[PDB]
Amino acid sequence: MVHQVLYRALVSTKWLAESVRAGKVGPGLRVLDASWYSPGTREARKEYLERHVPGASFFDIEECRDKASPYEVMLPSEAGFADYVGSLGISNDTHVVVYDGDDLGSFYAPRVWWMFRVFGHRTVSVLNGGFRNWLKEGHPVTSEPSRPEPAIFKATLNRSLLKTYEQVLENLESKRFQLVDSRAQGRYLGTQPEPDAVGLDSGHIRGSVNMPFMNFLTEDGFEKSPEELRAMFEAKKVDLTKPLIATCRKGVTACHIALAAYLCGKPDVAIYDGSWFEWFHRAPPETWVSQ
Ligand code: NA
Question: Is 255 assigned a catalytic role?
């Protein structure tokens, strides 16, 4: 097809609350809290245990990753992903809805949406407005235990939605793909340090453009409209008809670029999973710049 038929990437709090009330959480619909916070800040699993959407599971990104990698938040193996999500009651037929507790409204949820897609699962969405707006609207929360029945999931890597270090290095020369970095402006420019690391300089990969991820959300933490999102890409000279790689610190907020592009009808954005954390450690310093 010239354009694939895209599955809904956003669901509303009203839709999810109606679904939960109707008893739809089960093999057909699973809900995940994917929150993660930098050390010494919020407690993701404790917050989940105190308050979650009824029937939701905690998706532990610290566990569901390649823990043998020297780099941050790297995809697990197909088997690792499949075993973990099957333990949360997710099969290949399940609609997965992801949220997180970010204070603006989204941080890790798009990363898990992308993880499902990069493992061949299209039936996945994020909660528009996050747990922030679930709470603000007064929708039900519980501390009751979720105990989903186990399921079988088959994970198949879609390599078109992933980029490696080697492919990003080839792209410095080929310029086949636009490289878009979702880090905050100061970190992208090199005027603010990279946090939560030893000796990791800030700056950015030569040729990359900066689209700080929080610009995709409204002040209330909802996704901007497709018309607004398209305008943002156009004003950054990112052409949605041309190939696009998204990158950030560790491959997490880059998935907000992929989500924004998907809502504009461009599902083919690939994530540089290694991102700046891998780049700075592996690449020659001639490949990146800092103010
Ligand atoms: Na990563």
Answer: no
